[PDB]
Amino acid sequence: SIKIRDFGLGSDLISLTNKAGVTISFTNLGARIVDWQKDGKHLILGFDSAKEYLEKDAYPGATVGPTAGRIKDGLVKISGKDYILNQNEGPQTLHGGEESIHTKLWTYEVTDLGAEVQVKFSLVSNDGTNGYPGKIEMSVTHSFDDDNKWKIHYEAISDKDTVFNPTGHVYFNLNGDASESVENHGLRLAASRFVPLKDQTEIVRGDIVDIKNTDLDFRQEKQLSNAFNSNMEQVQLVKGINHPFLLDQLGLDKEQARLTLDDTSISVFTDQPSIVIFTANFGDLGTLYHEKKQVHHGGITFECQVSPGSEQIPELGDISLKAGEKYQATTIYSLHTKLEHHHHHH
Amino acid sequence: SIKIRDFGLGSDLISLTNKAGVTISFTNLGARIVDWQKDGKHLILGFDSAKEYLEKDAYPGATVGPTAGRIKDGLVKISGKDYILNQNEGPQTLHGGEESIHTKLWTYEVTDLGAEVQVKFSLVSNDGTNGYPGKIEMSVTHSFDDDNKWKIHYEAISDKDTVFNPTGHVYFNLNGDASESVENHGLRLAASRFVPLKDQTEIVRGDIVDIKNTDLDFRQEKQLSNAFNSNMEQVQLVKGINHPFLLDQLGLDKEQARLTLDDTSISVFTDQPSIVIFTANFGDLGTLYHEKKQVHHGGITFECQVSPGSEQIPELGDISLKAGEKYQATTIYSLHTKL
Numbered sequence: 015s016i017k018i019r020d021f022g023l024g025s026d027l028i029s030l031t032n033k034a035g036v037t038i039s040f041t042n043l044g045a046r047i048v049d050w051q052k053d054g055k056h057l058i059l060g061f062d063s064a065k066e067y068l069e070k071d072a073y074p075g076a077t078v079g080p081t082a083g084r085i086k087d088g089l090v091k092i093s094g095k096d097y098i099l100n101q102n103e104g105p106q107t108l109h110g111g112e113e114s115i116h117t118k119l120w121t122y123e124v125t126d127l128g129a130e131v132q133v134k135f136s137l138v139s140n141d142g143t144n145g146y147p148g149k150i151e152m153s154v155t156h157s158f159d160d161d162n163k164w165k166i167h168y169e170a171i172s173d174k175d176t177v178f179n180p181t182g183h184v185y186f187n188l189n190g191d192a193s194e195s196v197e198n199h200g201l202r203l204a205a206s207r208f209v210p211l212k213d214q215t216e217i218v219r220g221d222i223v224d225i226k227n228t229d230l231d232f233r234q235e236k237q238l239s240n241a242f243n244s245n246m247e248q249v250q251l252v253k254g255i256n257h258p259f260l261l262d263q264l265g266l267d268k269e270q271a272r273l274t275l276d277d278t279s280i281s282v283f284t285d286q287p288s289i290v291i292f293t294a295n296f297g298d299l300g301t302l303y304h305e306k307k308q309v310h311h312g313g314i315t316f317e318c319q320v321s322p323g324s325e326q327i328p329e330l331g332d333i334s335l336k337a338g339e340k341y342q343a344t345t346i347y348s349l350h351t352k353l354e355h356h357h358h359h360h
Numbered sequence: 361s362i363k364i365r366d367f368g369l370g371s372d373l374i375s376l377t378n379k380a381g382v383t384i385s386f387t388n389l390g391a392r393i394v395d396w397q398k399d400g401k402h403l404i405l406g407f408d409s410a411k412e413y414l415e416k417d418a419y420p421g422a423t424v425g426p427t428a429g430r431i432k433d434g435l436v437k438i439s440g441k442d443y444i445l446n447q448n449e450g451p452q453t454l455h456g457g458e459e460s461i462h463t464k465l466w467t468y469e470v471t472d473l474g475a476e477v478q479v480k481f482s483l484v485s486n487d488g489t490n491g492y493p494g495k496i497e498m499s500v501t502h503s504f505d506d507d508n509k510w511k512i513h514y515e516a517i518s519d520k521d522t523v524f525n526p527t528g529h530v531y532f533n534l535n536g537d538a539s540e541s542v543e544n545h546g547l548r549l550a551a552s553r554f555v556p557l558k559d560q561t562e563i564v565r566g567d568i569v570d571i572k573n574t575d576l577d578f579r580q581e582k583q584l585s586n587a588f589n590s591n592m593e594q595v596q597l598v599k600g601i602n603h604p605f606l607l608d609q610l611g612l613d614k615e616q617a618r619l620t621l622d623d624t625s626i627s628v629f630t631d632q633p634s635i636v637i638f639t640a641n642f643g644d645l646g647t648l649y650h651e652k653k654q655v656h657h658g659g660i661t662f663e664c665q666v667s668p669g670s671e672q673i674p675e676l677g678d679i680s681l682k683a684g685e686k687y688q689a690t691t692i693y694s695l696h697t698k699l
């Protein structure tokens with residue numbers, strides 16, 4: 015079933031329930047996921063109204079871009095030309111600049127395919143918006159099926175050579191309470207290397223580091239507490255995790271990551287080369303989620319994209335988008351029950 | 361009473377009915393007026409869904425900008441520097457460039473004051489959007505009251521020196537049917553001068569012209585057909601009227617124009633110095649409104665703003681907006697019915 019209602023400020027809330035009774039909801043404000051519940055329990059973080067997003071934190075669950083992550087000094091080279099983008103985090107351009115796509119009302123249309131329902135959000139980034147050459151016609155399709163798979167499909171075309179590397183900013187918290195740390199969740203991630211950050215400004219260091227056998231090694235499932243408790247320089251630098259992880263094997267067919275809590279698991283699939291993992295290292299900020307003060311480490315993202323820093327570390331990839339060329343990216347989050355035995359105590 | 365409903369593509373339709381039973385409706389798609397009716401008759405042109413506007417014509421009833429009108433070669437000078445805006449009509453920048461603010465979904469909040477109801481639409485134009493320096497935080501408040509006054513109040517703030525001169529693009533048709541020319545309406549307009557167009561590109565010609573005692577003088581009420589049957593080269597040029605008229609006296613208190621058809625009249629008030637009047641000179645286009653095929657002259661606008669062409673005729677004014685300065689504008693469309 016599909017249901018729609020006003021969500022506030024002119025935004026709408028689109029709620030889907032699949033045949034298994036799992037419900038998930040989105041809003042056109044930032045083509046974003048608002049909630050995902052199983053048996054009355056929230057699997058992710060979200061607010062109850064549009065205003066909350068604009069007043070507390072506009073990122074959760076949003077579609078972010080045109081370029082996700084930090085661009086050192088907002089400087090990009092496009093077809094032999096240097097371009098300076100809006101700098102909204104010191105001299106850095108973070109998640110596309112100020113008042114970016116995650117803050118806009120996107121138009122949308124719903125396609126009911128029976129076992130699958132698709133919500134296609136659309137938006138045009140005008141040429142020059144926040145320094146980005148365009149215009150760029152973008153679309154984000156969020157779909158949910160009877161198999162409990164939530165898929166995000168991005169598409170985009172530009173009138174001019176530009177840069178494009180968006181991502182989905184959902185935060186998971188299998189505890190279903192933001193006031194509960196995710197250190198109790200088990201994490202498995204098919205990545206042998208990571209990208210260290212230079213300092214508190216969080217731009218990339220310039221090197222790629224192997225993490226096998228360190229506290230950041232999750233190739234084999236381990237509790238998140240291991241990382242949180244680590245005194246490795248990078249962990250301390252960011253007070254948790256906030257880094258791009260380079261996937262060892264690419265392809266949408268492979269389970270790149272799996273997050274488990276007791277009988278529930280979320281598997282991550284994507285066609286992107288890295289996963290930026292941010293563990294809500296907010297300290298005592300205590301943003302309220304459903305009247306619960308969120309704790310430090312009260313959530314975890316899996317931002318699949320081309321790793322940030324490619325401006326400095328060419329090896330990470332090329333986020334350039336040629337005029338007329340069609341961009342596409344696909345990321346999938348699938349829900350499972352009793353996928354494995356996870357019986358721990360914190 | 362207030363009613364909110366889905367207008368399509370995720371856009372909303374906000375309908376306001378006052379004590380008099382008059383109904384006015386708006387959509388966040390382009391902070392625009394969709395309908396205005398009395399006793400079941402539409403006073404303005406509009407569509408029945410969001411899609412239609414996107415597919416047929418996106419300007420009707422919309423808020424247009426940042427700059428309304430045509431800018432020669434898309435060129436403006438800001439703080440002594442030349443800036444090239446998005447060009448969407450040949451080398452001209454028309455109505456702020458392609459995919460402008462009239463095609464975006466604005467956020468909004470409704471405020472019920474009893475005798476009056478306000479609907480405040482907001483949108484942020486990012487710095488650099490379509491070549492315009494910013495960011496510009498814009499808000500357009502459409503309000504409707506028990507006196508049948510529809511008021512538009514504009515406000516904006518920019519982080520950088522820029523240009524700003526928006527307008528409301530409603531088309532009136534007291535016939536209540538697009539298939540019917542407005543030639544039968546009577547118009548009065550407090551303007552003795554106008555701005556002639558250079559040619560078919562519709563950019564300004566360069567001069568200001570006195571219209572006193574011409575087919576374009578409406579200082580004294582007159583029927584539209586007059587203007588429409590005039591052989592003035594300017595009329596002949598655009599096949600109707602598509603020009604900025606320079607108001608004689610400035611100020612919100614003075615009724616600047618009046619459109620009348622029988623018992624029904626619309627008065628226009630503004631704090632702007634000019635009114636651009638366009639008589640839907642669409643030829644055989646035939647755009648469909650409420651299943652009615654539109655006729656040439658099947659509508660008329662009252663675009664209140666600073667006259668287009670100030671880039672070439674500074675006497676017309678200046679549309680710059682310095683960083684940190686607050687822009688404000690107001691335009692009123694008052695409805696009256698004789699007894």
Ligand SMILES: OC[C@H]1O[C@H](O)[C@H](O)[C@@H](O)[C@H]1O
Nearest residue numbers: 073083256290291292315317
């Ligand atoms: O709150 C948004 C969040 O987005 C990414 O994960 C960044 O790496 C974090 O530093 C933070 O900016």
Ligand SMILES: OC[C@H]1O[C@H](O)[C@H](O)[C@@H](O)[C@H]1O
Nearest residue numbers: 419562602636637638661663
């Ligand atoms: O269609 C929108 C309309 O906008 C103004 O009124 C112009 O003068 C007309 O030429 C036309 O372009």
Ligand code: NA
Nearest residue numbers: 026370371372
């Ligand atoms: Na809506």
